[PDB]
């Protein structure tokens, strides 16, 4: 269609899976309370100085988070944000700041359960925010205490219980700091993944999300596409809990859009093996061809699921390559013994039969590629079942030109992609340029 | 030898460790069963609805894996693969598909132990596949239940046991999803590392591999070079177990091949400090010089161990640099206070004595580098024991030219490697080019 697939296959770019394009949007929110400190009432006789030291260390961790959150809460009034008081912010910080303000309308109800949050003695409990709303409290290490320390009070010495508690708390903080430590300069954000907030509950995000009652057909893709996120909207440094707003978006199918994967196959040119350097994921919207940074997206067999639009510009030469101008397609020399030397597409086999041994199962005859050919197309109009190494493939028919193997193409320029090679090429061209100029 | 080490050392590229080159190959395989769901018989009175919800969530995770595996199992017949039915595949997917077919010959025997797999109540058990073969079943969370929940049935309330089980299962799934979730679009693969499959057993790959009876001199290098891999060959969504084929290859020493490390040392040129931009790992095979992507390989003091051939092309100018044309070697300006200013090789010290203070321990005299010199070579024909800062080094003798310090070289062009600088340099050269053209 839009990509000139026949000429592209001739330079090792075999049409791969066509995937549809999705972006997360329109999220609904829920608030959950994470208690950052366990209830040690049932082990209290043997806690010693542990909880006192724990609370001090934890306050140091949570305090700068609370501060950054308050900065926005003290600047937004009713919903107008004090741009002067904020001074410097990105659009993302401002938007998150608005979401923060709105969230406080509910955080204020949750906070009236302060004493009911303090008293929770189970890993997960149900409190009433309002008669019509529930808020759950997830408590760090509460299960550890309830099943590992409480039953052991009269089995191990009292001092050993103290040490066991101290270590459980210290390990919790060591893991907690990666996310809730100094790295979190922007707690006023709605882009922070839920798997990163669940660290406050031991990394157990499945319990967190199940507790909230969320389960959808697209749920696992939303998780691994980093679309389910949360925002810390409130921090309590006396009771040691945080209120987290969790965003549950839906995936919007982008209309007239898809991501086309190309399967890179080495090919022959001038008695050497080459691989083409083009995007192996081309994003097409309407009739526009652009690049996509799929390294930030979840790729399934059916779709590319992104948490934002990751479309990027493409040069004119690459677009011209993709639409048929193979003289514009860069190639890198293959020096490695481990590259794709063939690919299957549409039931048709595209292979470099100079670098692999292509034998026909039906006749026992070799499939011979001439020096002038890049790849051979092997389909069942020539060989119904083909052997490549120890792999036997039953082939279909090619729906493109019957003369595919009889027509040569222009092949583009050699390039080198090593980061060092890029610097070398720039300075070399620059010296040639100075001679010319 | 092949690299012009004497001229290279003069631009800050001091010969480092010569390592031999290895690639994993010829793997032998074993099948192991991982039970994805614990046996709760001894806690069954207090499991509530937990296992029912667990199984549903787990089926959602395993179901798409089973589906992708069946796609190939339904297309391969006897070993011919239905290229038409597959439609689109890479050589790697096709090869893995063949391995999958072969694996089923044994999976079919393991599956006859279905009821014996269901009944396992220990983290590791030994079942008979055939009279002459054993298959082990590794069970997720079985130890947790056997030592943490079973002994506590009459110590904690029944409801607390239910919650403890629910959390253990939920944490397991939260960790499991990173690998066995939507990210695994290609379960039909034999390149997936064993440390990634062991997640199905809590990440405990040492138990998995010990159970299989594998232990070799090269075992730890195979693990950290990502050479020990497995393939999911069978998924059972009723009994909740997977059959994993584990590949145990051997390391093949590549003949007439080595990787030469260069130790980058800053040097003086035109009253400023420079670092050379060349590959710091040069792969040499026979007499060919190429680049190696060691970022994907395990580097030990003796060898570079790769799970495939990671050789890449090198430009003519870089190769010319490495073979003695120092006018072709790019240099980047040093603006940082933390760069290597010296290196030790062969017992000989190569140092930029303009940027460091080089003092001779034997005489108390300063070692003076002139403006025309890049580096000084300090060996024991000049100073037997030398002081660089607070480091005292007893030196050997240089086996190259005695006039090393007396002979100047051409120094190549300045470059900038910042990603922004690369874009800037390209557009700047392009405008100069348009003036010329």
């Amino acid at each position, epitope marked *: 269609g839009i990509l000139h697939y026949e000429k592209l296959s001739k330079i090792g770019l075999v049409k791969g899976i066509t995937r549809k394009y999705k972006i997360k949007s*329109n999220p*609904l929110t829920k608030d959950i309370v994470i208690k950052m400190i366990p209830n040690v009432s049932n082990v209290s006789k043997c806690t010693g100085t542990v909880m006192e030291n724990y609370k001090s260390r934890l306050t140091g961790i949570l305090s700068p988070i609370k501060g950054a959150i308050e900065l926005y809460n003290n600047n937004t009034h009713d919903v107008v944000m004090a741009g002067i008081a904020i001074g410097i912010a990105t659009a993302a910080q401002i938007t998150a700041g608005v979401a923060l303000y709105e969230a406080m309308k509910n955080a204020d109800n949750i906070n009236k359960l302060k004493s009911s949050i303090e008293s929770t003695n189970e890993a997960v409990v149900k409190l009433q925010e309002t008669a*019509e709303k529930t808020v759950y409290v997830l408590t760090a290490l509460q299960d550890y205490i309830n099943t590992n320390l409480v039953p052991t009070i009269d089995q191990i010495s009292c001092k050993q219980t103290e040490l066991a508690l101290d270590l459980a708390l210290s390990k919790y903080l060591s893991d907690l700091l990666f996310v809730f430590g100094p790295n979190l300069q922007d707690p006023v954000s709605n882009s922070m993944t839920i798997q990163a907030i669940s660290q406050a509950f031991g990394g157990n995000y499945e319990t967190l999300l199940r507790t909230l*009652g969320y*389960a959808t*057909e697209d749920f696992d893709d939303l998780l691994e596409s980093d679309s389910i996120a949360g925002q810390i909207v409130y921090v309590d440094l006396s009771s040691y809990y945080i209120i987290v707003r969790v965003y549950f978006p839906i995936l919007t199918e982008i209309q007239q859009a898809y991501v086309q994967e190309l399967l890179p196959v080495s090919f022959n040119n001038d008695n050497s093996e080459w691989i083409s350097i083009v995007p192996n994921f081309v994003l097409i919207r309407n009739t526009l061809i652009s690049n996509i940074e799929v390294k930030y997206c979840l790729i399934t067999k059916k779709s590319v699921i992104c948490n934002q639009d990751y479309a990027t510009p493409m040069t004119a030469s690459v677009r011209e390559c993709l639409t048929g101008s193979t003289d514009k397609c860069p190639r890198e020399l293959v020096v490695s013994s481990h590259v794709p030397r063939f690919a299957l597409s549409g039931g048709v086999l595209f292979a470099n039969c100079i670098s692999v041994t292509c034998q026909c199962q039906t006749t026992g005859r070799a499939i011979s590629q001439s020096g002038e050919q890049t790849l051979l197309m092997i389909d069942n109009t020539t060989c119904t079942t083909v052997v490549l190494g120890n792999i036997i493939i039953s082939l279909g028919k090619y729906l493109g030109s019957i003369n595919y193997n009889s027509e040569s193409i222009a092949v583009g320029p050699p390039v080198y992609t090593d980061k060092v090679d890029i610097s070398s090429q720039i300075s070399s061209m620059n010296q040639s340029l100075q001679q010319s100029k | 030898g092949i690299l012009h080490y004497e001229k290279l050392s003069k631009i800050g590229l001091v010969k480092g460790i010569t390592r031999k080159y290895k690639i994993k190959s010829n793997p032998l395989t074993k099948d192991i069963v991982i039970k994805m769901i614990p046996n709760v018989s001894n806690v069954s009175k207090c499991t509530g*609805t937990v296992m029912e919800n667990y*199984k*549903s*969530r787990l089926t959602g995770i395993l179901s798409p894996i089973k589906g992708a595996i069946e796609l190939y199992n339904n297309n391969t017949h006897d070993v011919v693969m239905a290229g038409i039915a597959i439609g689109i595949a890479t050589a790697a997917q096709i090869t893995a598909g063949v391995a999958l077919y072969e694996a089923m010959k044994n999976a079919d025997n393991i599956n006859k132990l279905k009821s014996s797999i269901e009944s396992t109540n220990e983290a590791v058990v030994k079942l008979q596949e055939t009279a002459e073969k054993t298959v082990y079943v590794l069970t997720a969370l079985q130890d947790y239940i056997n030592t943490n929940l079973v002994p506590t049935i009459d110590q904690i309330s029944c409801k607390q046991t239910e919650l403890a089980l629910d959390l253990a299962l939920s944490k397991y799934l939260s960790d499991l999803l990173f690998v066995f979730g939507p990210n695994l679009q290609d379960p039909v693969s034999n390149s997936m590392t064993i440390q990634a499959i062991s997640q199905a057993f809590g990440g405990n790959y040492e138990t998995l591999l010990r159970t299989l009876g594998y232990a070799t001199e090269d075992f730890d290098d195979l693990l950290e070079s990502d050479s020990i891999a497995g393939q999911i060959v069978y998924v059972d969504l009723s009994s909740y177990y997977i059959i994993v084929r584990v590949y145990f290859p051997i390391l093949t020493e590549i003949q007439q091949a080595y990787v030469q490390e260069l130790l980058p040392v800053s040097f003086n040129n035109d009253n400023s400090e420079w670092i050379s931009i060349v590959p710091n790992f040069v792969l040499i095979r026979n007499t060919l010089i190429s680049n190696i992507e060691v970022k994907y390989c395990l580097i030990t003091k003796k060898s570079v161990i790769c799970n495939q051939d990671y050789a890449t092309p090198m430009t003519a100018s870089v190769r010319e640099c490495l073979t003695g044309s120092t006018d072709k070697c790019p240099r980047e300006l040093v603006v940082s206070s933390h760069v290597p200013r010296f290196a030790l090789s062969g017992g000989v010290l190569f140092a930029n004595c303009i940027s460091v203070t080089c003092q001779c321990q034997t005489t108390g005299r300063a070692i003076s580098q002139s403006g025309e010199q890049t580096l000084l070579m300090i060996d024991n024909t000049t100073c037997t024991t030398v002081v660089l800062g607070n480091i005292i080094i007893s030196l050997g003798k240089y086996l190259g030219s005695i006039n090393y310090n007396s002979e100047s070289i051409a120094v190549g062009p300045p470059v900038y490697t910042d990603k922004v600088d690369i874009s800037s340099q390209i557009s700047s050269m392009n405008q100069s080019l348009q003036q010329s053209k």
Partner: antibody
Amino acid sequence: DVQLQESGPGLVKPSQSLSLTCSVTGYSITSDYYWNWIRQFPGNKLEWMGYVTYDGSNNYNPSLKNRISITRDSSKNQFFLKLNSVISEDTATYYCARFGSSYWAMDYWGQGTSLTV
Amino acid sequence: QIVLTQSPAIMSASLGEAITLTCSASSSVSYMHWYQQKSGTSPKLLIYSTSNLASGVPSRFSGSGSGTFYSLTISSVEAEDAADYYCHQWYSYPWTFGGGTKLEIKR
């Protein structure tokens, strides 16, 4: 405290375009939630038709995907169900409902507009 | 779509006795919601997320289930329970309802 009140013609001819309006009081149609349409057939069988979200995005029941459009009018705090063309089978009581995260269910329902075709 | 079925279509119970209303799904869902429709009124959420009681719902109601099988239990059935109870899933699109079961009160 949302009162969803739907209204429209109680009778349209075959091949006419149907337009039902759901007036919402007590909450802004643009600030939150998903705004749904559901219809109940004479046999009391319930069918979900689709929704428009707070930002204007749509999600429809595939069986009638090519005949349905759910839109909003923020200035009146209303949302609308439009069917490009109606068929005799489309005789049903049409309800509007609010979907949200509190229950992950449609909780507030209107009274229903009984439509004859 | 996911088809929800609720058989038998009509059930009956005496005053004061428990009755279980059931639902089966053609494909697994994680949660099931239940709605109660009394004559002359729109369906009103009864049970949400399988086991929870909605805003104005009497303690007589409860529920459970997983995967493809769910139930709505009415303890101590009374006259106000004479309604069409619907099984609803929102797990996959389109969102669907079962045909609904009518609970008759014996007199």
